Enzyme design. Sequence first.
Site, mmCIF file in Angstrom:
data_model
loop_
_atom_site.group_PDB
_atom_site.id
_atom_site.type_symbol
_atom_site.label_atom_id
_atom_site.label_comp_id
_atom_site.label_asym_id
_atom_site.label_seq_id
_atom_site.Cartn_x
_atom_site.Cartn_y
_atom_site.Cartn_z
ATOM 1 N N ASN A 78 8.979 1.231 -56.350
ATOM 2 C CA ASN A 78 8.482 0.336 -57.388
ATOM 3 C C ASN A 78 6.972 0.144 -57.342
ATOM 4 O OD1 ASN A 78 11.416 -1.254 -56.470
ATOM 5 N ND2 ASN A 78 11.170 -0.403 -58.532
ATOM 6 N N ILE A 85 2.767 -2.496 -59.651
ATOM 7 C CA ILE A 85 3.981 -3.013 -59.018
ATOM 8 C C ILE A 85 4.994 -3.324 -60.107
ATOM 9 C CG2 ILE A 85 4.999 -4.740 -57.515
ATOM 10 C CD1 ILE A 85 2.246 -5.411 -56.478
ATOM 11 N N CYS A 86 6.130 -2.637 -60.093
ATOM 12 C CA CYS A 86 7.191 -2.949 -61.051
ATOM 13 C C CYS A 86 7.982 -4.139 -60.525
ATOM 14 C CB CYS A 86 8.100 -1.750 -61.277
ATOM 15 S SG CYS A 86 9.265 -2.064 -62.606
ATOM 16 N N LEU A 87 7.610 -5.338 -60.974
ATOM 17 C CA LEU A 87 8.230 -6.585 -60.535
ATOM 18 C C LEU A 87 8.395 -7.491 -61.750
ATOM 19 C CD1 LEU A 87 9.189 -8.318 -58.067
ATOM 20 C CD2 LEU A 87 6.807 -9.119 -57.901
#
Length: 148
Positions: A78, A85-87
């Site tokens: 991620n 940041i894939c959040l």
Amino acid sequence: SMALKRIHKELNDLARDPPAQCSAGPVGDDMFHWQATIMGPNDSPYQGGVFFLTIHFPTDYPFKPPKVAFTTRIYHPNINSNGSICLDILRSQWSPALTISKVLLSICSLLCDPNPDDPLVPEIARIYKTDREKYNRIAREWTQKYAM
């Protein structure tokens, strides 16, 4: 501005309630630009590394999320080589009740438990789903090479 007072409040709360093994704050007198540090969670493959991040608060924080970039190289489904940041709480699930402290703890949780179904690096997501043991091996090696 309301953003500046919120940022100051979060900074004082951070000082008085230090997060689990994380740090964050302004480098210099620009309150809208912070640096942050995360130590690799124990029992994660990143244990022993230290990971640096930059944080940019928008002028209408907390009504839009901070922009967070991972500066340290890391092997993770991620987080990509642009430091993105894939959040979800940094994007569609952001809420003004969230704080930098909460964001940093959520990043630590994501390091312990990636979300391979929303990949930023598809091949790392595939190794994580298909061969956790090799994923952990490589993530450890990259921690030793790039985060220590």
